[PDB]
Amino acid sequence: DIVMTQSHKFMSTSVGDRVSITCKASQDVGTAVAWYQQKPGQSPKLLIYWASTRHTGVPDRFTGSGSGTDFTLTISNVQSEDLADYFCQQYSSYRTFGGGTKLEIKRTVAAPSVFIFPPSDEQLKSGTASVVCLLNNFYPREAKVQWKVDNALQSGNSQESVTEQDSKDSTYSLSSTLTLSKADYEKHKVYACEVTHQGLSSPVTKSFNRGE
Amino acid sequence: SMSEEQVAQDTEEVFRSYVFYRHQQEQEAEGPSSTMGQVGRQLAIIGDDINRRYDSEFQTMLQHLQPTAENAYEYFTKIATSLFESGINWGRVVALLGFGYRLALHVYQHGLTGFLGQVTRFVVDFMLHHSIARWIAQRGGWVAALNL
Amino acid sequence: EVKLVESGAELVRPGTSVKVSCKASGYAFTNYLIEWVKQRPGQGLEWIGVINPGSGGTNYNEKFKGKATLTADKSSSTAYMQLTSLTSDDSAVYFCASPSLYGSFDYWGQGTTVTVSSASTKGPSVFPLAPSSGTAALGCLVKDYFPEPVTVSWNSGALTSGVHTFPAVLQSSGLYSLSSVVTVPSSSLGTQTYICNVNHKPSNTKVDKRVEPK
């Protein structure tokens, strides 16, 4: 198999700047390389074919270059409609795609706002307990969430979900949901959510006391 | 003046337009806004008895020895050299485009692999190394093919 | 114009077979190839195979030989992709495409979602995430629904600023769960009522839940 390697899964740019997405093939593919843009919910769209030839309807700010193994998609004067996924591809007899590169807007570091939600009593009647922790409007998508029940670190009982960058804030939000049995929830008192992030001087803990 | 390299660059558009218009005619019979695009189109339309014969030879050999993406360069070099062994005229240059079209089409339709970008480079590299591009440059370039 | 229109979403149980269609219009179906691509949730693109509708000749990604069978009907100008012995790893979005003579995939279909699960269609349970708390946060826990999608609005559409509806996660039960959170000034807690509106059309369950301060 020919492996198209996009070394950077995320790239930070600014509107009006220029950004280049690199793509290295595991073999010589000549110039039989294409670049595709994909936006959430939509089919991929061809931007550059033949390594450097712009497809019909594609803005002049998209340019491709390269031959052999190294190929680069350069977007001049980045617009907001350009924030999307970008896949390189070699279309030899056995076609393979690159891993993709998601374009994001550069922004200053923003510490998250941490909120913890104890299980609602309506859910506790049903027999399960969900403890939700919210990390709101932070820029560096890198975030660490540690669950501690009675100062005991939890593992494997937390699921995480992250939002895409805000159109206006350029921030991200993350929810961590600790799922516990009702009986296990009532066997313990202190439920804490520890958050590690670049914007935070020290990790921040948000806790509640069951029934307090 | 028309340099040898200016002919080589212009050959990309000429061959692309040639392939587009040849495929269009072939699909209508089955059932430009550029100077080099006009050249390609004027060379795609010509249907004399030598070019129709050339196409019959190109098809028969490709149906007999199916070209693959791995032999296409050696396949191209053999027929392209065969076309300019006696000499160089516009009729042979058009047959070169004609073979490039049938080669790219066969690799696409039989080998399930797009090869127009590679065959285009085959045509350009051949004309550069075997004096075909300078022969065209002496006649003022591809524009000379417009008014045969 | 050139259009590729694929079949509707498929929701099937493991071990079954599905056959996705890809209808072509605005060009000669027999003279251009049909490519098939697989995209897993949140993941990248993976080539499956190609077929020449005129000749019925096929080449496959070696991973998919014996799994995906590509066919084409010339009369209907439709390509087909048959997947057998479906497992969770086959849950993805499948695109059909048609390449130019260069090989680049110029025209793409809209995409067919194939979801392989043994879970049964179920409406969600909506539980409040109550605020207490300079700003306050509140939300609704939309838990144990299948299949996707679910839509959450706040105050019937009147509240949109600060709203973060998180992408659902898939639980070990095979059911989906998400949280829809909104941040508001703590002063608003007593000046405004907050009602999350949860619509899950696959089950026809509609639920409004008022999130009151405690």
Author numbering:
A (entry chain L): 1 to 212
B (entry chain C): 21 to 51, 67 to 183
C (entry chain H): 1 to 133, 139 to 219
Paper text:
BAX and BAK are pro-apoptotic members of the BCL2 family that are required to permeabilize the mitochondrial outer membrane.
14G6 binds BAK by cradling the α5-α6 hinge region and making contacts with BAK α1. CDR-H3 L101 has inserted itself into the pocket usually occupied by the linchpin residue M60, making hydrophobic contacts with V39 and H43.
